Each structure stands twice: as structure tokens, then as C-alpha cells.
Design an enzyme around this catalytic site. Structure first.
Site, mmCIF file in Angstrom:
data_model
loop_
_atom_site.group_PDB
_atom_site.id
_atom_site.type_symbol
_atom_site.label_atom_id
_atom_site.label_comp_id
_atom_site.label_asym_id
_atom_site.label_seq_id
_atom_site.Cartn_x
_atom_site.Cartn_y
_atom_site.Cartn_z
ATOM 1 N N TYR A 214 111.180 88.847 11.307
ATOM 2 C CA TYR A 214 112.330 88.161 11.144
ATOM 3 C C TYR A 214 113.745 89.089 11.592
ATOM 4 O O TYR A 214 114.620 88.424 11.256
ATOM 5 C CB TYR A 214 112.155 87.420 9.674
ATOM 6 C CG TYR A 214 111.221 86.778 9.522
ATOM 7 C CD1 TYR A 214 111.219 85.383 9.765
ATOM 8 C CD2 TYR A 214 109.605 87.150 8.914
ATOM 9 C CE1 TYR A 214 110.256 84.374 9.687
ATOM 10 C CE2 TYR A 214 108.931 86.145 8.880
ATOM 11 C CZ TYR A 214 108.806 84.671 9.415
ATOM 12 O OH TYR A 214 107.956 83.858 9.096
ATOM 13 N N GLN A 215 113.261 89.821 12.329
ATOM 14 C CA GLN A 215 114.462 90.317 13.235
ATOM 15 C C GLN A 215 115.592 91.117 12.642
ATOM 16 O O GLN A 215 116.663 91.281 13.281
ATOM 17 C CB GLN A 215 114.807 89.321 14.501
ATOM 18 C CG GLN A 215 113.803 88.721 15.132
ATOM 19 C CD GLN A 215 114.121 87.521 15.872
ATOM 20 O OE1 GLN A 215 113.788 86.253 15.460
ATOM 21 N NE2 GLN A 215 115.107 87.351 16.763
ATOM 22 N N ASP B 193 118.680 81.875 4.096
ATOM 23 C CA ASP B 193 118.510 82.655 2.751
ATOM 24 C C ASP B 193 119.279 83.514 2.343
ATOM 25 O O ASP B 193 119.558 83.773 0.929
ATOM 26 C CB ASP B 193 117.241 83.689 3.028
ATOM 27 C CG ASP B 193 115.959 83.087 3.960
ATOM 28 O OD1 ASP B 193 116.000 81.879 4.482
ATOM 29 O OD2 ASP B 193 115.144 83.937 4.010
ATOM 30 N N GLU C 92 110.395 72.779 6.981
ATOM 31 C CA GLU C 92 110.096 72.722 8.512
ATOM 32 C C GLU C 92 108.906 72.437 9.112
ATOM 33 O O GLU C 92 108.996 72.007 10.307
ATOM 34 C CB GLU C 92 109.952 74.621 8.603
ATOM 35 C CG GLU C 92 111.477 75.102 8.212
ATOM 36 C CD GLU C 92 111.418 76.637 8.923
ATOM 37 O OE1 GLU C 92 110.032 77.136 9.177
ATOM 38 O OE2 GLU C 92 112.452 77.138 9.132
ATOM 39 N N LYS D 218 106.174 71.950 3.327
ATOM 40 C CA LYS D 218 106.034 73.636 3.298
ATOM 41 C C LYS D 218 106.658 74.234 2.003
ATOM 42 O O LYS D 218 106.130 75.122 1.438
ATOM 43 C CB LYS D 218 106.818 74.065 4.573
ATOM 44 C CG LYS D 218 106.440 75.625 4.655
ATOM 45 C CD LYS D 218 107.059 76.276 5.966
ATOM 46 C CE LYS D 218 106.965 77.624 6.206
ATOM 47 N NZ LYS D 218 107.706 78.026 7.298
HETATM 48 O O1 BGC Z 1 112.833 83.511 5.237
HETATM 49 C C1 BGC Z 1 113.080 83.000 6.562
HETATM 50 C C2 BGC Z 1 112.489 81.583 6.857
HETATM 51 O O2 BGC Z 1 110.840 81.858 6.543
HETATM 52 C C3 BGC Z 1 110.589 80.315 6.723
HETATM 53 O O3 BGC Z 1 108.823 80.731 6.619
HETATM 54 C C4 BGC Z 1 110.914 79.576 5.846
HETATM 55 O O4 BGC Z 1 110.253 78.148 6.304
HETATM 56 C C5 BGC Z 1 112.412 79.291 6.119
HETATM 57 O O5 BGC Z 1 113.209 78.269 5.260
HETATM 58 C C6 BGC Z 1 113.089 80.700 5.858
HETATM 59 O O6 BGC Z 1 114.606 80.634 6.132
#
Ligand code: BGC
Ligand code: BGC
Ligand code: CA
Ligand code: CA
Lengths: 761, 767
Positions: A327-328, A334, A475, A587
Site C-alpha cells: 500500500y505504498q 483511511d 469497492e 466488501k
Molecule cells: O486500506 C486501504 C484500502 O484497502 C482496501 O482493501 C479497502 O477496500 C479500501 O477502502 C481502503 O482504503
């Protein structure tokens, strides 16, 4: 007391102890027992570990895109590497060690191991090691490593810097150049994409006298000390690892050398870090009475939030923090919606600087909007240094064909923008910080309103505006229209913008308008949209439709029944042709997320009916989901159900319960949003804390598993302490320049003046 | 004067002959060699064939949705089944027969086989069989079947009604009830969904004095004739197969038996069919001088177009005609854009009826628009009896996973509605039929304009309307915005509606507005749309972008290189993650389709630059595509390039060039749109024919492969014949003869007031 889970316990409420080593669980352990300080994260590995045990030191502001797709933080050389041989035999962790414990001490960010293992020569060797990343000197991570034998034996200790580190999406550093200094070695290297300089300096002090010999090769450098261990006489090594990049300072090698030269001993630096952590916990600790497991799990999460939060420079909180490169190291929605509230109510200057980070990166949002055919600010889904989008078009693969799939996280998930405007307005309501709105927040809200006005469509035959072709918090459904969360959030932004036009003083307003070229024609379009934009509302059964046509998708209750349709276990579930696409399986919280952000917008019975409709249709396949349902459950008096979702959420990392991989991408590491939401579940969820205008709401409920809890909340500069027992609620206004407030406890008004106010069930 | 391909030849340019039997070619051969009459299609199988050889008789207006998904026409019991044994040995076609040919005689819709095969007892048996679907008595299909042996031998002929027939999406008939009548057997059955009655009647006459035993089983009925064949002495069997449904008449069993009773002999019925076909070829025949392969491929195409066209009742032309059940026997935009033009210029009452079918089905279009949240008329992508949408949401499967894929043919491919508005305006320009516009066409155009206004979005910061989330004629790219073909067609429709509101007389205009509740506020929106809708325009290099962001997709030239990415050979190429989705490879003409409908929309240089840009990016996976490029190329005097695409288009079925299975769904059968397009490529493309009120235009070009071509047109009731050769053009008016006829041949005006005008013609290959 006791037993948290696998083989984990707490003795004090401030420590997590694992008393059996199992190599399967090592690594999940590297995340959970990590140390850090907002500048770096250093995984909870042991001093002998390298790339095969996923050791890593991830350092903020070292973004690199070596593989041409994934821009992520660099992992840097490891200057704590330390290897023991005992009469020729390497010391290797076994699951049958005579004795093993690893401990994370949350009161000070100190992680450690004590292990005793009998060697082939009969000698029982005990190693105690502990490490912490200094919160006082944020560029330094320190270790004390002690070895002891119960029997006279020869041994060799190697220690140095390992260059050959784990990196997920390509090696980020090249050009490694060795150098020495009076207390050890150093390595300087350059990043691949931007050619930034990164220097790691090692200091090393060993308390036993021994011939020592150095080595330098392409994979690392260091030195070896032959030891004659005497029965029961321990030998101690103390090391510091210091890291600077050219993004932190002008001549990083020079700077790293100075920091190294003036480093104090392990113990002196440990005492200074402890004083900083006493101060952190004075802001953020939330107490839970007579449930030490919940007490320590809450501290674990808050600890992880704090060590993920950069406070040394204007930088994002990563969605996996600095626990790994996934996630970089970058900000998602968040950051404002899950991480900011603890700071807003406990140490508001930190929340302000979060919002100032979004101001500083407003140009990245303006460029993203323009690139995509819009105007205003469409914030990046994944934001790093400048605010330019870091989220690839092809995040995932279809694991059944091996082909990339195009998910529109980066260009249809528009709610990021009004989520930022929401956070601006919340920060203003809670703190009363007018100057922030004048200098930064008004410009932000108006550019976000301009973006929403440029995305919206007008449908003249329906007489209304609509937000078509979006992706909402759930998502898995892409290409949806009038997602209820996004529509409402868009209307809350336009309403905030309208309020500022009517409320700012004429000089500030003229200045902001001239700065962003805001015309009367746009302001008229915003007011037309406020009057005529479609907003999904409760139908005759009270249910708010998640997006247009969601009611015609296939009902699967409970939602996990959809997992029976998988062909391969690691298929992405969502768009374009995953198993959930034409079903109602979601989700994560989407309509329920609306109620977390706006707890009094709908009445308790509408929220209950929507909870009872959507909860059984939610997969909770994002760590963001269980805490949202906890918070809503707590305030429609489903307290015990809220408690269960609280436990789901606070235990996600500690007891290991979520997917490491999905659609061929690594998703694992610490879940930073869930760390932030731990505090919210207690204070906004069970406590019911919300602020509307001048109005402070509290509605404290109490899970049967606890006897009480206490927390601090700062509202309009007043530090309040809220204490909840079986029988009562006590609100104390601590603070020098104390003013009158006015509450709403369970819906009754009660003007607070000066330290009294006890009420009951 | 012979070879077309495979082992396919023509002798006279009116016949196609295949002189090798190949069992693998049966699906293709049975489509190509079929017979039909607009009421039914009877596949060109031989009299012993059944389910395993894909025999079928497909009957109009017997729609059924037995499987709960595909509503398709029914295949009915086969009353021509005829099986021969010779000394107990069955006659089975061998790929190595002593002699074999099958022939389709395009002059009269008669399909035939002559075959000689040596049997185990040493006898060489010769079968001669021919069948035709009567164009005179549209409910009848007839057969004459002759057997002869060079050696005395026992034989048995089993003839009857096979019920156990091939059906693609489940069996459509149930309840089969056997009955007999003086000349053979019959069966009556009911459809599964709607319980409509279908009756098939068999008539049977054998000219050998041999006797017979009858049988009736659950899979069929018939009779066996044990024969004693005499060397050199043939035996002839004549049959009729007559079909009626309760959607055609109130008492289909009685009517089928009344038809049976009044049948004449095979030879008398054949002669009446011949007369009807002479009349049909006198309207539609287009001749080509000194290229007998192009001449026969052109007639083969026209023939298929004719037998796919229902003239007996208001019904669609199917996109695979009646050749099989694929594409549901239903109308697609193919019907107006590809099949209508030959009728429009050659026999315009048929075009008028095509459009009245769209008027009759306007309520199905209004229910589709309402169901999808819009207003007005959103015509069905796949239209059958009522106009309600027949196209499933799940047309295809992802063959890698076995899961259904959702393609949006049925709800994002919106151009179907303005395509129909376009065909209404074209019909009116060619014919001057004001009455059609008063009674039907203005209502259609206004409901279609209302639908477009309901679909569009307004972008207030851009100050303009746009058409977002559509799919254009290139079906592979879905969820695209401002497809150029769609956005221009929408603006032509609103322009046409606006012209009617400003022009029609107050009486006609009030009656229409009142019937559909057309409000002033609606009219003001259409006029605002006309002034402020985004329409994609040529860029600095002359190129019109096919949809927003098309230029940012991956260029693959030649486009076929993209098929190297396929993981299974039969994957669907398009949405949502097919190999073409993020590339510039296109299924079929899309920007080039706009110039087919609107040949003067942009100047010749702009059309040429787009042709050159898009043709190499086109896969032509669709049979609709090559003819569009041929027409555009001929209209800009790229004659030889137009001829290259003409040759591709006319041979699509004859040479079996297109894929039969995609995405797990059968898409084979005869390609009716391409069959209809053969005539336009010659007459509107090479001929340049167009008709605008009083003015008739020709711009006759001539490929180097031909020495001339001729065609007929019926313009405002005058029959004109046109003969083009390299050095001249002749036009005759061969009718009742009203003098008022004005012609423009290239730039030059002639008044056609005598019976023949002859002008010299210069070469119009572009230099
Ligand atoms: O945590 C970063 C992202 O992870 C994803 O799997 C969630 O669906 C997103 O809502 C969240 O922003
Ligand atoms: O012929 C029926 C349909 O076939 C599809 O393959 C083509 O892409 C369509 O344009 C055509 O309408
Ligand atoms: Ca000191
Ligand atoms: Ca309830």
C-alpha cells in the site's frame, strides 16, 4: 491476567508476550512486534534475520518506482545484522528451543526476545536482545544484544550491515558505497527512479575484548569477534543504525555521521525514548476497567497508529504504515476517516497537520482532476509526496487468465475528495480553529466543491443532478450510479461551501476566491445542485439503496455463501467478473459508513433497519469494515453485537485474521486504519462522542465484558475526561482557561460548568 | 466460367454446385444451399438427414422460450424424411461417392443433389432429389426424389415425419399428436411458453405400384415401401410438407389439411414457383458483365436476402434469416441499415412495411425505455413479435472460467433508436411518401428524439450535452463516451424532429403531439441539445476519434496480431477483459459506418484520412464490416480498394470465412446483413445511386475486374434500368412513362423524358 490468543499473553496490560516460537507464525510476528517512530518502521525480526525472514527497515520519503509500475518506500540496508556461531555451529531458532519468549512493550516501543537453546557441544546458549526506534532521535534504531553460556565455550559473533534486503516490487537502491567511521561502518546508495541518496550508518560497541577483523563485500560489510564465553558471564553488544536520505537533509552522509558520532549509550537513549512515550501515552491512552485482554489489544492498536504517523515532516500515514512496502506507505481516505479522529480529540495539532498535508498536496489533486477532464481537486486515491496519483490502473490480475484487470480505484472512487472536505469541517467543528479555515481549509472545501460540480451530470428530464459511474466504499461494485454514501458526502461538501460563502469575512473570502478564480456562475451552480441533486433516501421499508439498481442484484445471505462460487482460492472478488459483481455481497461498510460519519442524520430506527439489512450482506473483506458496524451497533443498542465487531476489529493483526494476497497482489502487513478505529470504537462508538455545531453529544454504553472505561476528549480547546462505570457517567473539565460547554447526554441538554457532572444509566 | 472456391463452381451464373461431399461442412452447406420464402427456411440437407446433420425447418412467428433465456423460432417436425436401404444396406453419403453434386438453382430457389454410390450387393444406386419452398403457397415446401439402380435389387423406402428435430436452445414443441388424411400423415403440437398450436401436414405420392406398412411412434410416423427395383427403371416419390400455426390462422390443423387437399402436382407447383421467382428477379437482379464469379456470388447474396424477408405478415427479417435459430429470427439494426436499401430503391412498398413493423412495435420500444429509466422509444436490440427486448443480458460466457459475462448490447447500444429514425427519413427522401410520415413516421421520430433527450447528460461546467456509457457499432468497446457514430446519429434525429416541428402542417402536428403528449418543455430541450451537444469532429490530422480516449488505447497494426494473445481460440474478444478491450482493434466499421449512412457529411479528404486510419485497425470479425468499407471507398473513388472489400463481403458464406462459435454461443447461419449489403455495394456504392425528392443522382464507377453492370430502380413509380460500362452509361425508363424525371450523372443534368439516354462515361479511379 492472561491469555490473549494463540500463545500470546499480557502480564501488565502494556506488553504482548509470545512464549512459543513457531516459524509459520514468525513474519506475522515481524509486523505485530515491529518498532518505529513515524520516520521509519523496523520489523520485529531477530538480529540474525535477513531476507528469508522478511526483515525490513522501511523509511519515509524514499519513494521509488524501479519496476516501472509500483511507487513504494525503499527498504534500506540493515545495520543490526548479528550472527552467532558456538564452537562452529550457527545459532538458528528452533521450535524446540529450551526456552523462547518475544515481548513487545507498548509503553515504550521496545521489542525483544529471550531464547535459550542447547548447542551440539552441550553448552546452553541464552541470547536476550531488545531494540527500539528512538522517538527522541527519529533517525536512529538501537539494539542491545547479550549472549551467555552456562558452560565455558568458544564462539564467534559477526555483526555489520546487510545490503541484501527484502523489497517487494524490485530493489530500490543501487550503487552501494562502503565507508568506515570511528565506531563502525556505513553505506551510501542511490534510489533507482529519482536518484535520491540514502545513507545507513552503523555504530557497534562490544564489552568483551577480543581480536576483531573486518570484511567488506558486495552484499554487506561488518566485523567478527571470536569470544571465549565463561559460564554465566554475559557479553553485551550495543548497536545503533542511523538513516538519512537526501529528502530529509542536504548532505545526508555527513548528517548520518554526525548523528552517529553523538549517539549516547543504548541505556541513555532508551531512557530518553521512554520519556517521549510517557508523553505520547498521556495523550492517547484509553482505559478499560477489568478486561486486561481488551485493554492491551486497544493499546496495541493505538501503539501501531502512533508508530505509523510521521510527525517530523509533512508526509502521509500509510495504509499499512511502515510495517512493509504494501500500500505504498501512502495516504488513502483511511488517513482522514479512520486515523485522524484519535488525533483530533487527543492532540489536535496532529490532526491539523494531516489536513495541512492535504493542503500541501492540493496541486496534485488539481492536476489529477484536470487530467481526467474535470476541474477543482480530485484527490489521489493513493497519495505519497506530491499528491499525484500513485495507484496503478492495473492493481490486480484475473488469476484465471493471468491478464491484468482494470479496477477504477484511481478514477471512479471519487468519495476521497468530499471525505477530505468532511474531515476539514469536522476539524473546524471540534477545535474552533478559524485560522485553519481562513488560511487553508476554505480553499480546500471550495476546490473539492468545484470538482464535485464538474463530475456531476444534470438530467433535465428528471430535473435533478446525479453522480454517475462511480465506485463507493464497497469497492467490489464498480460503474454504479448514485452511490448513497458518495451522494450524501457530496451534498455535505456543497453545504459546507455554501456556509463558508455566507460566513467568512469579506477580506478572506475575496482573497480565496481570487486565488482559485471562483466565479459567480460556479457559486450559482453549487446552489442549484444543493437544491436539486438526487440523494438516495429510505424507501417504504426504511432501507437506503446502496447505489441505483443494487436491489435487483442477487440476494445472498449471509454474504460468505458467495465464496462457494470461487474457482481459485485467491481470485479477486470484485469487478469486472468476480463472484460478487452481480450480487448484493459487499466488501465493506458503505451505507453503514454514512451513519458512522453522520451519526444523527437518520433516526435510530432507520439506522437499525439498514444495519439489519446490510450487515448480513457484508463480507468484511476490508479491515475498515468491522469497526464501522461496531460503531453503528453501539448506538442502536445492539451493544453486545457491537462488542463482537469491536473484537473482530481490534484483533485483526494480533490474531492474524485477514487475506495477505488477493488478485496476485500482496495486501498484508499491519492494518493502520483498523488501528485508528480502535480508539474510535471506544470513544465515538461506545462513548457516543460526536460534535454537531456548538453541540457536544455523549451517549455512553457499556459492553458486559467491561466494568467501565475512561477517555479524554478535547473539544474547543477544553480537555474533558469522560469516565463510565456501571452506575454512572462523570465528565470533568480539566484545564487553565476553562469555558462553559453544554452537553447532550442521551439526548438531554446540560450545560457543563467546571468539573461537576455525574449522571446515571 | 466455373471455380468459386473449395470444390464450388457455377455453370451459368445462376447456380452454385459443390461436387464433393464433406461431412464436416454440414452446418455451412445446409445454410448456403437452403430454400425458403420469408415464411419458413428449410436447410439444404438431403432427404435422409436428421438431427445429426443439422436438418431444420424454421418457421416464422413460432417464438418460444422453453429454456427460460433464449426466445427463438421453433424448428418443426420434418415431413420430408426419406431413408433408402438397398438389399438391407442403408444408403449413407460417402466422401468418396462414385459421383456427387449438390446444386442451388438461384433462379428459382430449387436445391438438389444427384449422387451415385455402389452398394454391397454390387448395385450402383443413383438418387436425384430436389426441393423448393413455394413462393406461391408460402406454407408449403415440396420435394421430388427419384431412385434408380443399374442392377435389379430389393430396396426399402421409409418416408414420413421426423419429430426428433435439432433445436438449439431446448425443444420448443410438446404434446405431439399424430393424425392421418387421404395423402399421408400429419402432426399437431403446442409450443412450450405460449402454447401456440403448430401443425405439419405431409403429402406423399409414390409412382411404383409397391405396397406399404405404416408406423406411428413417439419420435415420428411414416410408412415403409419394400420395392423390387428393375435395372434402369426409376421410381419417383413426390412430397409436400405444409405448415400452419395458430399465430397465422385460427384453425391451423384444418387450414393445413385444406392446403393439402388443393395442392397440385410437384411439377405444376414448381412451375408456379418459377413464375413468382421470375417476378422477384425482375425487381432485384443486378448483372455483372464478364465476371461470372462475382455475378453468381451477388445473386447468391440477393437470393438469401429475399428468402429471409417475410412478406406475408408484419414480421422482422432475422439477422441469420431463417437459416437456423441463431440470432432469434429477430430484427437488429441490420434490418433497416443493411437489408432495407435494396427494397427502398427496387420495391419500396417492402421498405414501407419494414418501417411499419417498427411502428407496430413502438410500444415494446417504450416499455424498454421505461424499464431502463428513460422516456420515449429505446428500440429493442433484438426485436421479435412485440418489440420487447429479446437479447439476454448474458449473451456470452467467459470460456476461461465458464461464467456468464454481462455484455450491454441490450441496454448501452443505444444507436438502434436513431438508426430507425434515420431509415424513416431516408424512406421519405427516396419515396416522397408524406402519408407514411403523417400516419407513422413523425410519431417514431419524435419518440426516438424523446428517448435521446432522456439518455443524454448535461455537463454544466462544459456548457454542453454528451452521450456517456454507450457501446457503438464496434461492439468490443463498451462503457465508452461520445461514440462519434452515436453522437452524430443522435443530432441527425433531433435535427429531423426539429425540421418536422417547424414544417409539418398544424393539423398533422397537433394530432401527433397529442397522441404522445409532446410538451413545449420537451421541444425546448431538443432545441437546446441541437445547439449545445458535443459532436466529435476531425482533429488536426483529419481523424475523428471513435469515442473519448480511443487514441490512448494500444495501437496494433495489422489488427489481427491481437489474436496472438488469445488463451482459447473461441474466447469472446470484447468486454469486459477480452484481448481487444484496451487496444485500438475494432470489431467492425464504426466511424466509417457514419459515412455509409451520410456520404457527404465530411469532405472527401477527411473521409479518406479516416478510412486509411481505421481500416488497418479493423478486424472485420463481423460480417457487417467489409461492405461498409467497400461502400465508403467506392464513394470517394477508391474503386479498386472498394472492389477488394466487395470480394471479401460477397464471399463470407460461400467460402465459410467467419467464426461459427464465440464465447460459448452459436453465431453461425447465413449472414443476412451481408447478403443485403451485396446489392448496395454495387448500386449505391459503385453506381453512386441516390434519390432526394425529384433528383436522382448516379456517379457510376467500374472496378477493373468487370466490363459492366446493370441494375433496376423504381423511382417515384417509374422503372429505370441503368447499364454502366467502361466507356458509357445508358439509362432507360421502361414504365407507364411520366416525363418529369431529372437525373444528375456525375455533375451533368439530364431530363429523362424519352425512353433511353446514353452518355459517355470517363474513368473515376481517384488519382
Ligand atoms: O486500506 C486501504 C484500502 O484497502 C482496501 O482493501 C479497502 O477496500 C479500501 O477502502 C481502503 O482504503
Ligand atoms: O448481425 C447481428 C449482429 O451481429 C453482431 O455480431 C454485430 O457486431 C452486430 O452489429 C450485428 O447487429
Ligand atoms: Ca552521555
Ligand atoms: Ca430490529
Amino acid at each position: 491476567m492472561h491469555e490473549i490468543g494463540e500463545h500470546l499473553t499480557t502480564n501488565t496490560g502494556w506488553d504482548i508476550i509470545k512464549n512459543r516460537y513457531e516459524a509459520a507464525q514468525a513474519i506475522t510476528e515481524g509486523s505485530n512486534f515491529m518498532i518505529g517512530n513515524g520516520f521509519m518502521g523496523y520489523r520485529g525480526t531477530f538480529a540474525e534475520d535477513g531476507k528469508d525472514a522478511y526483515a525490513a527497515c522501511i523509511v519515509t520519503d524514499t519513494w521509488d518506482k524501479a519496476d516501472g509500475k509500483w511507487e513504494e518506500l525503499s527498504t534500506v540496508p540493515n545495520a543490526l545484522l548479528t550472527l552467532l556461531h558456538v564452537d562452529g555451529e550457527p545459532f538458528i531458532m528452533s521450535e524446540e528451543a529450551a526456552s523462547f519468549e518475544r515481548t513487545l512493550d507498548l509503553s515504550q516501543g521496545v521489542t525483544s526476545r529471550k531464547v535459550s537453546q542447547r548447542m551440539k557441544n552441550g553448552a546452553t546458549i541464552t541470547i536476550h536482545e531488545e531494540k527500539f526506534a528512538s522517538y527522541r532521535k527519529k533517525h536512529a534504531v538501537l539494539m542491545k544484544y547479550t549472549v551467555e553460556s552456562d558452560q565455558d565455550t568458544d564462539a564467534v559473533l559477526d555483526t555489520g550491515i546487510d545490503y541484501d534486503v527484502w523489497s517487494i516490487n524490485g530493489d530500490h537502491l543501487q550503487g552501494h558505497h562502503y565507508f568506515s567511521h570511528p565506531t563502525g561502518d556505513g553505506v551510501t546508495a542511490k534510489t533507482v527512479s529519482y536518484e535520491d541518496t540514502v545513507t545507513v550508518v552503523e555504530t557497534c560497541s562490544l564489552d568483551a575484548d577480543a581480536s576483531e577483523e573486518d570484511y567488506q563485500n558486495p552484499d554487506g560489510s561488518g566485523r567478527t569477534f571470536p569470544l571465549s564465553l565463561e559460564a554465566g558471564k554475559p557479553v553485551t553488544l550495543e548497536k545503533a543504525m542511523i538513516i538519512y536520505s537526501s529528502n530529509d537533509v542536504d548532505n545526508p552522509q555527513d548528517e548520518a555521521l554526525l548523528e552517529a558520532k553523538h549517539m549516547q549509550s543504548y541505556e541513555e537513549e532508551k531512557a530518553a525514548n521512554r520519556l517521549e512515550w510517557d508523553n505520547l501515552w498521556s495523550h492517547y491512552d484509553v482505559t478499560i476497567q477489568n478486561n486486561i485482554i481488551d485493554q492491551v489489544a486497544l493499546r496495541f492498536n493505538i501503539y501501531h497508529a502512533i508508530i505509523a504517523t510521521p510527525v517530523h515532516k509533512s508526509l502521509p500515514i500509510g495504509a499499512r504504515g511502515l510495517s512493509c512496502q504494501a500500500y505504498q506507505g501512502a495516504a488513502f481516505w483511511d488517513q482522514e476517516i479512520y486515523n485522524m479522529p484519535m488525533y483530533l480529540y487527543s492532540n489536535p495539532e496532529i490532526a491539523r497537520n494531516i489536513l495541512k498535508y492535504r493542503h500541501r498536496t492540493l496541486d496534485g489533486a488539481r492536476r489529477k482532476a484536470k487530467r481526467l477532464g474535470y476541474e477543482g481537486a480530485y484527490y489521489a486515491w493513493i497519495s505519497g509526496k506530491t499528491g499525484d496519483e500513485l495507484c496503478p490502473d492495473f492493481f490486480f490480475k484475473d488469476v484465471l487468465s493471468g491478464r491484468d484487470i482494470r479496477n477504477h480505484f484511481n478514477d471512479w472512487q471519487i468519495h476521497i475528495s468530499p471525505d477530505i472536505a468532511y474531515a476539514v469541517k469536522k476539524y473546524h467543528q471540534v477545535t474552533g480553529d478559524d485560522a485553519f479555515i481562513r488560511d487553508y481549509g476554505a480553499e480546500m472545501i471550495f476546490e473539492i466543491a468545484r470538482f464535485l460540480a464538474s463530475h456531476a451530470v444534470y438530467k433535465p428530464m428528471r430535473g435533478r443532478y446525479e453522480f454517475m459511474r462511480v465506485q463507493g466504499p464497497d469497492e467490489y461494485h464498480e460503474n454504479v450510479d448514485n452511490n448513497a454514501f458518495t451522494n450524501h458526502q457530496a451534498m455535505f461538501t456543497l453545504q459546507a461551501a455554501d456556509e463558508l460563502l455566507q460566513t467568512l469575512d469579506e477580506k478572506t473570502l475575496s482573497a480565496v476566491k481570487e486565488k482559485i478564480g471562483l466565479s459567480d456562475d460556479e457559486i450559482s451552480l453549487w446552489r442549484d445542485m444543493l437544491a436539486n441533486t438526487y440523494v438516495p433516501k429510505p424507501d417504504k421499508h426504511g432501507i437506503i439503496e446502496q447505489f441505483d439498481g443494487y436491489y435487483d442484484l442477487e440476494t445472498i445471505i449471509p454474504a460468505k455463501k458467495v465464496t462457494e462460487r470461487l474457482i481459485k482460492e485467491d481470485e479477486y472478488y470484485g469487478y469486472p467478473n468476480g463472484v460478487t459483481v452481480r450480487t448484493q455481497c459487499i466488501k465493506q461498510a458503505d451505507v453503514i459508513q454514512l451513519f458512522v460519519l453522520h451519526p444523527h442524520l437518520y433516526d435510530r430506527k432507520t439506522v437499525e433497519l439498514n444495519y439489519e439489512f446490510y450487515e448480513p450482506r457484508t463480507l468484511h473483506f476490508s479491515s475498515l469494515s468491522p469497526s464501522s458496524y461496531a460503531i453503528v451497533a453501539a448506538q442502536i443498542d445492539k451493544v453486545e453485537e457491537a462488542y463482537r465487531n469491536f473484537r473482530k476489529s481490534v484483533m485483526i493483526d494480533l490474531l492474524n485474521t485477514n487475506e495477505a494476497v488477493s488478485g496476485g497482489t500482496f495486501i498484508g502487513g499491519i492494518h493502520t486504519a483498523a488501528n485508528g478505529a480502535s480508539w474510535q470504537m471506544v470513544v465515538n462508538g461506545f462513548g457516543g462522542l460526536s460534535v454537531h455545531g456548538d453541540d457536544i453529544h455523549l451517549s455512553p454504553r457499556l459492553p458486559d465484558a467491561w466494568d467501565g472505561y475512561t477517555f479524554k476528549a478535547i473539544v474547543k480547546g477544553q480537555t474533558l475526561e469522560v469516565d463510565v462505570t456501571k452506575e454512572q457517567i462523570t465528565i470533568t473539565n480539566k484545564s487553565e482557561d476553562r469555558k462553559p460547554l453544554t452537553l447532550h447526554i442521551f439526548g438531554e441538554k446540560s450545560v457543563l460548568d467546571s468539573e461537576r457532572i455525574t449522571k446515571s444509566r
